[PDB]
mmCIF file of N, CA and C and ligand atoms in Angstrom:
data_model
loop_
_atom_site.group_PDB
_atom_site.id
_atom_site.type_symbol
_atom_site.label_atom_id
_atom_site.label_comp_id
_atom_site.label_asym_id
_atom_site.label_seq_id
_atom_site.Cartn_x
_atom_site.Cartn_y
_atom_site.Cartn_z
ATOM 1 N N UNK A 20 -42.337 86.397 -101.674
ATOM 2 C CA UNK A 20 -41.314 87.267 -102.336
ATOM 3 C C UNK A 20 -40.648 88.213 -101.311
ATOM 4 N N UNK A 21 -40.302 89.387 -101.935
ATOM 5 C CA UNK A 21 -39.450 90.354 -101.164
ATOM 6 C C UNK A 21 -40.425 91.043 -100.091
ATOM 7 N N UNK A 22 -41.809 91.193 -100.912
ATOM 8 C CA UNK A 22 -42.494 91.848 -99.585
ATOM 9 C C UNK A 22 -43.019 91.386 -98.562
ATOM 10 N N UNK A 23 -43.127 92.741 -97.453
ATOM 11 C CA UNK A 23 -43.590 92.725 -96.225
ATOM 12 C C UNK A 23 -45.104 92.835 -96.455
ATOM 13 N N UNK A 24 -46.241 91.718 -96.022
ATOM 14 C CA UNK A 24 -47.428 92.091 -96.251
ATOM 15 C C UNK A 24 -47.991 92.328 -94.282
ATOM 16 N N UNK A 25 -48.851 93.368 -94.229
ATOM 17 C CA UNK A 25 -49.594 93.130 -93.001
ATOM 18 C C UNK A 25 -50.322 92.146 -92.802
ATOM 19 N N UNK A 26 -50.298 92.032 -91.384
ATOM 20 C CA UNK A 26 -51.178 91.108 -90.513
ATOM 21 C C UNK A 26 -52.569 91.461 -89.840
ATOM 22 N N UNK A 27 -52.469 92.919 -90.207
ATOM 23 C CA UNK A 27 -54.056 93.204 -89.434
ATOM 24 C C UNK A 27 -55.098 92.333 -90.194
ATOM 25 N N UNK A 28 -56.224 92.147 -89.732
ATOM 26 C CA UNK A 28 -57.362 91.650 -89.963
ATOM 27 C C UNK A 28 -58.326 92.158 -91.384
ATOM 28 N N UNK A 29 -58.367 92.096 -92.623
ATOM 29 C CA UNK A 29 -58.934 92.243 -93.738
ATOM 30 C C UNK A 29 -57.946 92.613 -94.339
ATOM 31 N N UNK A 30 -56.539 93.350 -93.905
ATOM 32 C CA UNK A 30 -55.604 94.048 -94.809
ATOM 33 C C UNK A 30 -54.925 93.386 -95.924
ATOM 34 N N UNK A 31 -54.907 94.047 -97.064
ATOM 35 C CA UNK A 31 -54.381 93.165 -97.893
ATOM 36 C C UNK A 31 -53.153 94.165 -98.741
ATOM 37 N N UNK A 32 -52.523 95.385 -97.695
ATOM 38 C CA UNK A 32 -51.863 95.408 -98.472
ATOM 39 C C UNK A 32 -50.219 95.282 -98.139
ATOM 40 N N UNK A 33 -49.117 95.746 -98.675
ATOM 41 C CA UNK A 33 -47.890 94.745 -98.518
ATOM 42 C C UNK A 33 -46.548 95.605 -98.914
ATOM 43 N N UNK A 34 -45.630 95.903 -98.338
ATOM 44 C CA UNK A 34 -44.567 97.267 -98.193
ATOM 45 C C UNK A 34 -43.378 96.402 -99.271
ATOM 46 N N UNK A 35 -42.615 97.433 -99.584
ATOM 47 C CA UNK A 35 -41.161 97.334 -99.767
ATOM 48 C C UNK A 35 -39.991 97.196 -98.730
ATOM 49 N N UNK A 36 -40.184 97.618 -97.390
ATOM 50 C CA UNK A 36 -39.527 96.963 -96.566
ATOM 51 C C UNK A 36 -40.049 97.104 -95.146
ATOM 52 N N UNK A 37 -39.553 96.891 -94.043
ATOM 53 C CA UNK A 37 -40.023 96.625 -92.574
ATOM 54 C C UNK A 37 -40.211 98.181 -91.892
ATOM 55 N N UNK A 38 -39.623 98.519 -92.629
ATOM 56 C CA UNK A 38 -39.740 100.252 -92.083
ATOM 57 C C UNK A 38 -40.774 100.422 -92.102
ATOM 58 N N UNK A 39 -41.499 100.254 -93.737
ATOM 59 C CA UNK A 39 -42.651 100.838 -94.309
ATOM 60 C C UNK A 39 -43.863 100.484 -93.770
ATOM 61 N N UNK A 40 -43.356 98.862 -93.419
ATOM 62 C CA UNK A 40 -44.843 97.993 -92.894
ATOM 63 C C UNK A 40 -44.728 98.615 -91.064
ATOM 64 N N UNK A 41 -43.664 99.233 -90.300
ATOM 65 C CA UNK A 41 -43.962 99.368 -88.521
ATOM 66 C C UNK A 41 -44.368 100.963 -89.165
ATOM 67 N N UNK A 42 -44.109 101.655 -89.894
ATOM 68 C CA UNK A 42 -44.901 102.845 -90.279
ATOM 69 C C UNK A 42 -46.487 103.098 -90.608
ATOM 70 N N UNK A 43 -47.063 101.541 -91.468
ATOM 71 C CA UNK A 43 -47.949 101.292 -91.674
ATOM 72 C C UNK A 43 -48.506 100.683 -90.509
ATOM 73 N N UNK A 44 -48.127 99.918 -89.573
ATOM 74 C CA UNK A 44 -48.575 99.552 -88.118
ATOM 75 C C UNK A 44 -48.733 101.041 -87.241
ATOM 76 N N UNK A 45 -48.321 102.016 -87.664
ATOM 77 C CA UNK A 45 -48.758 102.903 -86.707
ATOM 78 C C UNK A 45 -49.964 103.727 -87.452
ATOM 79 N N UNK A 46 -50.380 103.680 -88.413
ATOM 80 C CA UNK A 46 -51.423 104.134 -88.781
ATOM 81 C C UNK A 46 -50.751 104.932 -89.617
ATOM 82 N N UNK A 47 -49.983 105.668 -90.730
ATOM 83 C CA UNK A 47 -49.493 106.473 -91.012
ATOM 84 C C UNK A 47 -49.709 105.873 -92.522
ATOM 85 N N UNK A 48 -50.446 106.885 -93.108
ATOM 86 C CA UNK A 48 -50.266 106.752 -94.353
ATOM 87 C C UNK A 48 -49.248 106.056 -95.653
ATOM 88 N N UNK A 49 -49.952 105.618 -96.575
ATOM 89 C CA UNK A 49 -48.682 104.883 -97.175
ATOM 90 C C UNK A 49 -48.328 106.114 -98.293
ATOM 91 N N UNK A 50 -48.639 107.081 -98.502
ATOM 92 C CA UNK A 50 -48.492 107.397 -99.888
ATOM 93 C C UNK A 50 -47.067 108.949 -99.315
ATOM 94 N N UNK A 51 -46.638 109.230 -100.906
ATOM 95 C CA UNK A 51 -45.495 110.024 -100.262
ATOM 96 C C UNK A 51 -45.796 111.152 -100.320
ATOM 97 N N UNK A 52 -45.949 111.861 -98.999
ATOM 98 C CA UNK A 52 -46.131 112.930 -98.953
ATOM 99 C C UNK A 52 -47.013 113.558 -98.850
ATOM 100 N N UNK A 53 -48.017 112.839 -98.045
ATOM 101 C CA UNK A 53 -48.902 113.142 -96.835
ATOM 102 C C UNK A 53 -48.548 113.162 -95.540
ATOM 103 N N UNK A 54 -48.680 112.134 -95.332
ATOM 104 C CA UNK A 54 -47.644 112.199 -93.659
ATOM 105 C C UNK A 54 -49.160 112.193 -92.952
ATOM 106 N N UNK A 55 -50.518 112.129 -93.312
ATOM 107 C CA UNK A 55 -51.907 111.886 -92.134
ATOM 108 C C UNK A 55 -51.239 110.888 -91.365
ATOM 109 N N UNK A 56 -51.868 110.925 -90.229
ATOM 110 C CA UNK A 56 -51.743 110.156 -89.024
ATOM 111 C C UNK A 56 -53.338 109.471 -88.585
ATOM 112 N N UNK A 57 -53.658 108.478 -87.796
ATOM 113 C CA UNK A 57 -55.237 107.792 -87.675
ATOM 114 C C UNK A 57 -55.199 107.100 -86.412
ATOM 115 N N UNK A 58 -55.756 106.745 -86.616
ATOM 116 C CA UNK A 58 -56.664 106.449 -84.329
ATOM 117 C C UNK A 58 -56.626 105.168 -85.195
ATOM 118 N N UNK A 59 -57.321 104.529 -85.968
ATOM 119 C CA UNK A 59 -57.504 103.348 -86.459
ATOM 120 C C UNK A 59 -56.547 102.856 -87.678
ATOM 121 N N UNK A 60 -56.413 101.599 -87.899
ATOM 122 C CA UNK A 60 -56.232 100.884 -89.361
ATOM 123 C C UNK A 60 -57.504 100.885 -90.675
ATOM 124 N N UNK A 61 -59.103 100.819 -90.095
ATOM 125 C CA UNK A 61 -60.007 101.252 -90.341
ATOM 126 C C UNK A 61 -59.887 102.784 -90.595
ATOM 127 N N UNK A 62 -59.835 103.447 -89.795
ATOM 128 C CA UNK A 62 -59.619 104.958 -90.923
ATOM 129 C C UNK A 62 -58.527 105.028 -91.589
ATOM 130 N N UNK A 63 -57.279 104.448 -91.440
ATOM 131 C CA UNK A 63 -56.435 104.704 -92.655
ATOM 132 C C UNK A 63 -56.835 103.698 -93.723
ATOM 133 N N UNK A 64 -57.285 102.883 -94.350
ATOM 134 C CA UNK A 64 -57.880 101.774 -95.693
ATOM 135 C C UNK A 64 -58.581 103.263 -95.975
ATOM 136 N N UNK A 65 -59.561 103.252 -94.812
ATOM 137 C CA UNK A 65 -60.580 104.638 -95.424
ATOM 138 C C UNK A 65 -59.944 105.946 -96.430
ATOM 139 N N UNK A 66 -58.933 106.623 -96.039
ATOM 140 C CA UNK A 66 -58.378 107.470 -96.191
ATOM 141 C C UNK A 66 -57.356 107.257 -97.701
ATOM 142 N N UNK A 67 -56.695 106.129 -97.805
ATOM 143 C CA UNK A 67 -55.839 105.796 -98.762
ATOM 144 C C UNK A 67 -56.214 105.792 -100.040
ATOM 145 N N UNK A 68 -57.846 105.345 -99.803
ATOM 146 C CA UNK A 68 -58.594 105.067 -101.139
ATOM 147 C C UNK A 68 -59.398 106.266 -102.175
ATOM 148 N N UNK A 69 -58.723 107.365 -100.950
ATOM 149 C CA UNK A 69 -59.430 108.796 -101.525
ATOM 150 C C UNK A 69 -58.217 109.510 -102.452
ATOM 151 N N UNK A 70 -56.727 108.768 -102.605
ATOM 152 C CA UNK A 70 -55.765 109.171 -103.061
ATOM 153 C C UNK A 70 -55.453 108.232 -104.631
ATOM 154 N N UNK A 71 -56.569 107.168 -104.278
ATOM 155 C CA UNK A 71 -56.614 106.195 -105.549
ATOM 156 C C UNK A 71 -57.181 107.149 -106.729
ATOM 157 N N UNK A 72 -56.876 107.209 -107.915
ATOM 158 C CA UNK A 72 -57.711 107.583 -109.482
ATOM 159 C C UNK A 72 -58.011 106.330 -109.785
ATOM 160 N N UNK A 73 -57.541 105.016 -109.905
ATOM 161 C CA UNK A 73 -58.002 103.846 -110.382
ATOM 162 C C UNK A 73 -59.357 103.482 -109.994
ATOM 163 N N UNK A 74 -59.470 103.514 -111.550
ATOM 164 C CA UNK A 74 -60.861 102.890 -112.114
ATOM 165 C C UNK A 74 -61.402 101.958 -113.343
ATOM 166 N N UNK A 75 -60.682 100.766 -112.561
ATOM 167 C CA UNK A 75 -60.387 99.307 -113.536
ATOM 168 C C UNK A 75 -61.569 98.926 -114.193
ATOM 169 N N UNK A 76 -62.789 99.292 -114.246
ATOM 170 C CA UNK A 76 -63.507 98.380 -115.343
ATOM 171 C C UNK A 76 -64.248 99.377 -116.408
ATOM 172 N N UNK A 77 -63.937 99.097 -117.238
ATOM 173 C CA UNK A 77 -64.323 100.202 -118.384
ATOM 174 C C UNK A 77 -65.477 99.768 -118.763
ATOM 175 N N UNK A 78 -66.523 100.775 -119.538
ATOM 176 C CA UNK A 78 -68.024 100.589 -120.120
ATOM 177 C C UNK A 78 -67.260 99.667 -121.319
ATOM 178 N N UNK A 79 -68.295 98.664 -121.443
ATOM 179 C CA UNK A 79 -68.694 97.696 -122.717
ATOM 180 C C UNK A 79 -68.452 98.241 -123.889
ATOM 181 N N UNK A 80 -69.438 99.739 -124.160
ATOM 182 C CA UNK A 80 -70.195 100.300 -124.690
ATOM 183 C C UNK A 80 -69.137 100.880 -126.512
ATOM 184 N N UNK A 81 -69.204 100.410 -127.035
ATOM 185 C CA UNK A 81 -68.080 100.987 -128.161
ATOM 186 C C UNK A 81 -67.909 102.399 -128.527
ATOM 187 N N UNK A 82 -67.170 102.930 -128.266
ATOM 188 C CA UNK A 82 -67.550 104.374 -128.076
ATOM 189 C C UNK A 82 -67.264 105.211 -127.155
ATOM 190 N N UNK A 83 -67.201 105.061 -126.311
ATOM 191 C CA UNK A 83 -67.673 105.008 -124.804
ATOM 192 C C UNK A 83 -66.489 105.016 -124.045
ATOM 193 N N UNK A 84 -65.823 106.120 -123.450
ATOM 194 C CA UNK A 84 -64.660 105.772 -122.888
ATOM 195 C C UNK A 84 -64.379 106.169 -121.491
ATOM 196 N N UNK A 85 -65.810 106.238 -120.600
ATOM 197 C CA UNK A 85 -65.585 105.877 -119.367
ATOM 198 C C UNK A 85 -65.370 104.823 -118.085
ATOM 199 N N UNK A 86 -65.096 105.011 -116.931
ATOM 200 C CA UNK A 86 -64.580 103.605 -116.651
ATOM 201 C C UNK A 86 -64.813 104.260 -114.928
ATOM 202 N N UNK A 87 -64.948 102.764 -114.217
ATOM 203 C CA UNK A 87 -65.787 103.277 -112.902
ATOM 204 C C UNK A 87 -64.690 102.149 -112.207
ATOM 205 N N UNK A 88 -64.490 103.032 -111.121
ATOM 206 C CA UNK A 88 -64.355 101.742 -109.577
ATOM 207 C C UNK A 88 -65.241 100.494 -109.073
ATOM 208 N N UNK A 89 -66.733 100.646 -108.949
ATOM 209 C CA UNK A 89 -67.029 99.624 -108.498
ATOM 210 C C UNK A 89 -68.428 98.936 -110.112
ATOM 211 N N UNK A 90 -68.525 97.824 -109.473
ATOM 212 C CA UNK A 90 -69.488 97.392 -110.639
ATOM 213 C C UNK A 90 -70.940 97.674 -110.890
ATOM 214 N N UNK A 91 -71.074 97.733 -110.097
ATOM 215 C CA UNK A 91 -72.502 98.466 -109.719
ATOM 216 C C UNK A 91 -72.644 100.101 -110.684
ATOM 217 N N UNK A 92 -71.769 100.858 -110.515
ATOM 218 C CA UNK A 92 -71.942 101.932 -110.844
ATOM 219 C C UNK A 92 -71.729 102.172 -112.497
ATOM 220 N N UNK A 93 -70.553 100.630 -113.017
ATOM 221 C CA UNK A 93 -70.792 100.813 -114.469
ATOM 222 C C UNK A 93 -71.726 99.722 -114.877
ATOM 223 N N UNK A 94 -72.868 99.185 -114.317
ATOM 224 C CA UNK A 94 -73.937 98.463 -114.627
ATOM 225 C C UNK A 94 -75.036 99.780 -115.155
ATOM 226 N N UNK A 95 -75.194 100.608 -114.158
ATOM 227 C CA UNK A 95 -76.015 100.981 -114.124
ATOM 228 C C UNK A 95 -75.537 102.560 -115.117
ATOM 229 N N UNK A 96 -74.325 103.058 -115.385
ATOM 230 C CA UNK A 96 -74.009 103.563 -116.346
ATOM 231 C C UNK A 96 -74.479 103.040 -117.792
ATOM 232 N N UNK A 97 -73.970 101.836 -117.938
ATOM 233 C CA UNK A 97 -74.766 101.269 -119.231
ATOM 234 C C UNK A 97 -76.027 101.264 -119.703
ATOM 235 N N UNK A 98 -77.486 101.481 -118.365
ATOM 236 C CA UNK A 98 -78.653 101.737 -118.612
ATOM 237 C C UNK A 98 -78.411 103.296 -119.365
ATOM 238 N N UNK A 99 -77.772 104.328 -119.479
ATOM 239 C CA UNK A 99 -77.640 105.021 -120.303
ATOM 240 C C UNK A 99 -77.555 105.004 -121.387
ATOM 241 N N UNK A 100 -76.885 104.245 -122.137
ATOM 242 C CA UNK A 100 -77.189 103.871 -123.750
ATOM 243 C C UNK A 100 -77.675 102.752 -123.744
ATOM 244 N N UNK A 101 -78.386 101.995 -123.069
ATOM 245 C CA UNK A 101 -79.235 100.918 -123.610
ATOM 246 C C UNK A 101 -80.906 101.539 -123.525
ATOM 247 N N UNK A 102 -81.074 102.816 -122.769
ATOM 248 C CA UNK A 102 -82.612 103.353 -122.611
ATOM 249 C C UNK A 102 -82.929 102.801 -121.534
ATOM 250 N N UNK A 103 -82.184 101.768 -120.811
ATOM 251 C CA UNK A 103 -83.476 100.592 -120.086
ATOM 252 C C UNK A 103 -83.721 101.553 -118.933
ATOM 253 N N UNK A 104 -85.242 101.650 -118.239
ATOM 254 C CA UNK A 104 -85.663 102.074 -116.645
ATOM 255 C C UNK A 104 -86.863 101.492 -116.418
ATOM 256 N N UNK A 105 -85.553 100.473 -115.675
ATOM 257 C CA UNK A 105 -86.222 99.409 -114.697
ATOM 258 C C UNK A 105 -87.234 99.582 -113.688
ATOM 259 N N UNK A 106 -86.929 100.837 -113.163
ATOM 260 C CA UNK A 106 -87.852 101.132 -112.065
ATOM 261 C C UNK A 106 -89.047 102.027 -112.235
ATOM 262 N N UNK A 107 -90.580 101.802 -112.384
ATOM 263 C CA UNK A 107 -92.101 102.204 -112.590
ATOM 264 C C UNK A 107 -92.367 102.440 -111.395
ATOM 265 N N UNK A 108 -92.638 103.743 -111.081
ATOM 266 C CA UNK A 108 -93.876 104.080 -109.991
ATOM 267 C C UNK A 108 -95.220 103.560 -110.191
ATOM 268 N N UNK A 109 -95.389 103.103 -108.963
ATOM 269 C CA UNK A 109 -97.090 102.029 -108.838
ATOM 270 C C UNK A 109 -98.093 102.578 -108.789
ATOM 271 N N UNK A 110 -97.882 104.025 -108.492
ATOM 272 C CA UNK A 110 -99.194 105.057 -108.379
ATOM 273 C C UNK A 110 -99.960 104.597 -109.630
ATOM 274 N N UNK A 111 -101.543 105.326 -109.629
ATOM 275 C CA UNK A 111 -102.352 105.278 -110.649
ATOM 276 C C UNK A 111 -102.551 106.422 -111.806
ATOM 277 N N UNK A 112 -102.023 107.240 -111.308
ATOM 278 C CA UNK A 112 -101.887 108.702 -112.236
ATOM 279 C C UNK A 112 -100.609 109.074 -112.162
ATOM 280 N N UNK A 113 -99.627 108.494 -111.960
ATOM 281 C CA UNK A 113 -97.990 108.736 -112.542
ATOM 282 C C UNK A 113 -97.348 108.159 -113.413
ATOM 283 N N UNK A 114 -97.082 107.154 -113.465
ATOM 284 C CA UNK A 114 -96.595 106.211 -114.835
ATOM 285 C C UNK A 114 -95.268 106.695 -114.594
ATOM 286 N N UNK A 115 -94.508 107.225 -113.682
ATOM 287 C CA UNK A 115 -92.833 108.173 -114.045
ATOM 288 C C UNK A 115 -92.198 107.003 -113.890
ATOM 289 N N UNK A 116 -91.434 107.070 -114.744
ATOM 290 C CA UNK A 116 -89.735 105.632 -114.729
ATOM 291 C C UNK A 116 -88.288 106.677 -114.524
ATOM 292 N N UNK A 117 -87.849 105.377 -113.830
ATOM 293 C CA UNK A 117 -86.406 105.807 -113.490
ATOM 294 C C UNK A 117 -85.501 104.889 -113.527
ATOM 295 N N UNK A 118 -84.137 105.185 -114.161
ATOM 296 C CA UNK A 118 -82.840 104.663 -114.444
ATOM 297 C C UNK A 118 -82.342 103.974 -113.277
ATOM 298 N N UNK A 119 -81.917 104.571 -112.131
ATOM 299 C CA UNK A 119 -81.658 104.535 -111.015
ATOM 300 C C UNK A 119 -82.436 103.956 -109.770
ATOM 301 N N UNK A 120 -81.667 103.098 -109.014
ATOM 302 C CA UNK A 120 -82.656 102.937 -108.066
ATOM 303 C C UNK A 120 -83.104 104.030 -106.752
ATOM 304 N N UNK A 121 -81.580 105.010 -106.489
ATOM 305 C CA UNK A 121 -82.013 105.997 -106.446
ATOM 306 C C UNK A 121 -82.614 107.068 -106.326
ATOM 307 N N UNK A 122 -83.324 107.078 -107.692
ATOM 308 C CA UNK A 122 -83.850 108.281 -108.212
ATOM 309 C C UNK A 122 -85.338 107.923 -107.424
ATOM 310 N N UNK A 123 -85.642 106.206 -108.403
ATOM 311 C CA UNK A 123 -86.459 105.967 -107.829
ATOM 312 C C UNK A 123 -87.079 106.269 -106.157
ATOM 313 N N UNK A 124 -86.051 105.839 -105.132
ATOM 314 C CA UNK A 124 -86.182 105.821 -103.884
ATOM 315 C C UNK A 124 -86.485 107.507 -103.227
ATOM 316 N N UNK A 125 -86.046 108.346 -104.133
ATOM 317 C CA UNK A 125 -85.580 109.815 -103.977
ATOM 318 C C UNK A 125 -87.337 110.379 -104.396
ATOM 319 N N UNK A 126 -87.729 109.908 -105.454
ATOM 320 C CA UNK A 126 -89.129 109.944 -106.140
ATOM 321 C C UNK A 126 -90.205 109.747 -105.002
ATOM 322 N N UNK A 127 -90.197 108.406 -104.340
ATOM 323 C CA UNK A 127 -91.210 107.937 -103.058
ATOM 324 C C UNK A 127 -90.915 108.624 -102.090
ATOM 325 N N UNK A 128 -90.136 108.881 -101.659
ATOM 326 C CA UNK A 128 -89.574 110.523 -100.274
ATOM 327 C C UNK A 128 -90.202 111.817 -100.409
ATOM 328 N N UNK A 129 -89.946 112.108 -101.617
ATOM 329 C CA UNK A 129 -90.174 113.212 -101.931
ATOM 330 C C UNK A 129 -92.060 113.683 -102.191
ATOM 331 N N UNK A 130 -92.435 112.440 -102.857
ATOM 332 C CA UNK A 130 -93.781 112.598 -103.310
ATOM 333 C C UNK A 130 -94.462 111.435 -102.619
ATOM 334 N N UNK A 131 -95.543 111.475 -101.753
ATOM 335 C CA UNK A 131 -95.819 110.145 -101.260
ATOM 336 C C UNK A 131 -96.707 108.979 -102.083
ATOM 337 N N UNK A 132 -95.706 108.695 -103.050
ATOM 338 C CA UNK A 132 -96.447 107.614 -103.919
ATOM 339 C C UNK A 132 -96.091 105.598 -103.458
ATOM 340 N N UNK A 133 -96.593 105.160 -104.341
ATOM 341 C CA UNK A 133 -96.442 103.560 -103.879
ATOM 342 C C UNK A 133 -95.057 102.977 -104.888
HETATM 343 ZN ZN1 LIG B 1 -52.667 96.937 -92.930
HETATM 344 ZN ZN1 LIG B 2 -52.724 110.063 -97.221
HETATM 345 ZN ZN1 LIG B 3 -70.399 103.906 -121.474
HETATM 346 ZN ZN1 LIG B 4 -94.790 108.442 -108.798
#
């Protein structure tokens, strides 16, 4: 089509015209009215995605009207109204469960259990 997409290496994203994309070859932000500047193409992806609100996959859950960026984070949102915690400490006198793997991992640091 009409657009200019980059050529760097993982980039996938793609201008309205040639200006936008030798602007985007110099590292310069795409959004209007920032104007950051970057040493890398790697720190600008980094940087762009902190200007994103999109958060395409919404909870299942009927009711429920939050919605997350990655999948992982509304998997494990859903252990919230389903009760489930997957994760049991192995100790012999703790029995503590946790939602999170996390919490879990945060639990064995903190307290030296199995
Ligand atoms: Zn690019
Ligand atoms: Zn920016
Ligand atoms: Zn939910
Ligand atoms: Zn424990």
């Amino acid at each position: 089509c009409a657009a200019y997409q980059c050529n760097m290496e993982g980039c996938t994203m793609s201008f309205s015209s040639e200006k936008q994309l030798m602007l985007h070859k110099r590292n310069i932000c795409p959004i209007k009215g920032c104007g950051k500047n970057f040493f890398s193409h790697k720190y600008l992806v980094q940087h762009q995605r902190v200007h994103s609100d999109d958060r395409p996959l919404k909870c299942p859950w009927k009711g429920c009207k939050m919605t997350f960026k990655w999948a992982w984070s509304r998997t494990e949102h859903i252990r919230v109204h389903t009760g489930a915690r997957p994760y049991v400490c192995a100790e012999p006198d703790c029995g503590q469960t946790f939602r999170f793997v996390s919490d879990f991992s945060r639990h064995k640091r903190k307290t030296g259990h199995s």
